[PDB]
Amino acid sequence: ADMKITLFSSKPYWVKWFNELNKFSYEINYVTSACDIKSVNEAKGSEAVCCFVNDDLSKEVIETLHSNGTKVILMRCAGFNKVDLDTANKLGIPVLRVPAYSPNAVSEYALSLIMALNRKTHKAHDRVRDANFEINGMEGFNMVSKVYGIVGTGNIGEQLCRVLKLGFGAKVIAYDIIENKAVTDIGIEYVKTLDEIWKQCDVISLHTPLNSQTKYMVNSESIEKMRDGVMIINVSRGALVNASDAIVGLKSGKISSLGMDVYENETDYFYQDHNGSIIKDDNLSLLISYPNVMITSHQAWYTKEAISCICGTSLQNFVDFRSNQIKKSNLVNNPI
Ligand SMILES: NC(=O)c1ccc[n+]([C@@H]2O[C@H](COP(=O)([O-])OP(=O)(O)OC[C@H]3O[C@@H](n4cnc5c(N)ncnc54)[C@H](O)[C@@H]3O)[C@@H](O)[C@H]2O)c1
């Protein structure tokens, strides 16, 4: 019990890294299933549980977890939108996240999606595999010929700004409620209203969190106000884009391409192999089938450095918990 971790939403990459980095003699119970009320029993007698972005740390499961001997929750990710902190606080349970995995991983993936919808290397790859070497349809653009707008000049945003403005010499505009200095210091200009981003930008990448303001940022109102042939990247939170609006945009031609590593109803799909079963989500089924849409299963973060840091940090969180030395930066809630 005292040294046992039950790790929910296990996959081979989790096992591989958590073992490699487990230098502290911890017993790890890897559960393939996700942490929901049907699964929370598997943690019985486990002092610590480790969860990921799509686990269900709801009031009831937390209560069960506490009523069965677990005392610390380990978020092996920086997000916690699905953890009822209040239940945890009242039960004296710390939740401990990994606030800082390499943001370059997410920014350079966002670039990846741009390059891919641009030069269409996947399309090329799918054709050549079928012995079709015709390149009609794969005309791209020089990177400097488009105006990139970044919404959210934070930790990931800032990086995408550097690589663009610095690596290609492109014209880059930012919209943010604050104003990251690193962005203004390399001659990138901020616009006061998003309405300017639409008017001026050819490819837009979103790097804000999801909140009552940013939700459905991309919708019919804004899509209409956008340029023709706009490319939209979104590797942040799926709900920044109203997918059915986005489809209308794509159908009517207003939107040239769409790249998303995240999706509003992603919880019932990502990370799992569901071949042979009908996706019942029609927007998601359609987006996947459209030929100018990149949809990937929330993997922008998955580099060697990011997952090494994630696992190593969660394990470290456990040892900190037990030496009563929790790092302020990793404690999300406030238990008694
Ligand atoms: N694997 C993945 O796909 C993955 C990995 C890490 C982070 N993310 C997502 O990327 C998003 C941002 O990442 P980050 O680490 O750079 O966060 P961050 O705190 O460093 O930056 C968030 C920025 O959004 C700015 N902003 C501008 N307008 C805003 C508005 N109207 N409402 C709220 N914020 C506004 C804020 O000032 C802030 O700087 C996160 O929401 C996170 O969910 C995805």
UniProtKB/Swiss-Prot annotation:
- Positions contributing to NAD(+) binding: 155-156, 176, 208-209, 235-237, 261
Mind listing the GO molecular function terms for this protein? D-lactate dehydrogenase activity; NAD binding
- InterPro entries, per this entry? D-isomer_2_OHA_DH_cat_dom, D-isomer_DH_CS, D-isomer_DH_NAD-bd, NAD(P)-bd_dom_sf
EC no. given is 1.1.1.28
Q: Which GO terms describe its cellular component?
A: phagocytic vesicle
Identify the domain of life. Answer: Eukaryota
Q: Catalysed reaction per UniProt?
A: (R)-lactate + NAD(+) = pyruvate + NADH + H(+)
Pfam families xref list: 2-Hacid_dh, 2-Hacid_dh_C
Active-site residues are 237, 266, 298
Instruction: Supply the alphabetized keyword list.
Output: NAD, Oxidoreductase
Q: Which family does it belong to?
A: Belongs to the D-isomer specific 2-hydroxyacid dehydrogenase family.
Q: What is this protein called?
A: Putative D-lactate dehydrogenase
Q: Which gene encodes it?
A: ldhA
